[PDB]
């Protein structure tokens, strides 16, 4: 329903999965990862999630496959694959 405003709830864009925008998809090569954390910083779509072990993982629900993380990785620990 339209509220008097109309005010929106915070973080409600989660309802919009943008993973369907991808032509290419990033894939972590965990063996090559230095855990520097650059990929989490550089993601425009907050689709790089931290882990307790200090590695990172993708939220493919939202990843738009722009390839910035892959481009900025100093370890070439991310590969872009078609899809």
């Amino acid at each position: 329903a339209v509220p008097i405003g109309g005010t929106c709830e915070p973080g409600s864009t989660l309802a919009n999965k943008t993973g369907g925008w991808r032509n290419f998809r990033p894939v972590y090569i965990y063996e090559k990862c230095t855990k520097c954390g650059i990929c989490q910083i550089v993601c425009p779509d907050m689709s790089v999630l931290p882990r307790e072990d200090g590695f990172f993982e993708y939220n493919y629900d939202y990843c738009k496959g722009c390839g910035i993380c892959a481009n900025e990785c100093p370890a070439d620990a991310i590969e872009m694959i078609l899809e």
Binding site: G20, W21, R22, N23, K64, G65, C66, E83
Partner: protein, 170 residues
């Protein structure tokens, strides 16, 4: 009146396809109309464009909801977009894909037809510009517009061989 819906992603020039279709149809002596889905085009985002064909001037100003023909520029769109939505039973869906029609499995009564298009583009043009090449496939699949008129349009505004191959392959 015939109605055409084109599916693509921001940056893939779906509006140009719609425009070229309306230009080519008019060269054939059919009254035409073309327009983007009204909004802001985001790179990578699913987008739509539209064309109408008629023997008489087109005065209708509503959106297109039930197309006779559908063109899908990017196969990956099938996962998130209902491209067969609203299509007439005697309609045709043209899809840019390596796979053959039946492999795609779309819940529709309309004829599903496929061309690689992307490969045709990389082979002949060099770049993966599929918005114009798929129009060749459209002409071959539907017979609604002469393929020569589509060539005429693309050369006028600015490829023709890539249009020609797609016309054969469909």
């Amino acid at each position: 009146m015939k109605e055409i819906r084109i599916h693509g992603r921001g940056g893939q020039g779906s509006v140009t396809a719609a425009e070229m279709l309306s230009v080519a149809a008019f060269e054939d002596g059919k009254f035409s109309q073309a327009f983007p889905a009204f909004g802001v085009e985001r790179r990578g985002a699913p987008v739509q464009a539209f064309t109408r064909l008629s023997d008489s001037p087109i005065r209708l100003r509503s959106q297109i909801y039930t197309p006779d023909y559908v063109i899908v520029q990017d196969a990956t769109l099938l996962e998130t977009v209902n491209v067969a939505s609203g299509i007439k039973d005697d309609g045709i869906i043209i899809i840019n894909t390596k796979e053959k029609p039946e492999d795609l499995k779309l819940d529709t009564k309309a004829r599903v037809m496929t061309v690689d298009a992307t490969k045709v583009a990389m082979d002949i043009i060099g770049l993966p510009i599929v918005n114009t090449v798929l129009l060749g496939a459209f002409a071959g699949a539907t017979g609604e517009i002469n393929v020569e008129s589509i060539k005429k349009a693309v050369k006028d505004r600015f490829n023709a061989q890539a249009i020609q191959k797609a016309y054969e392959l469909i």
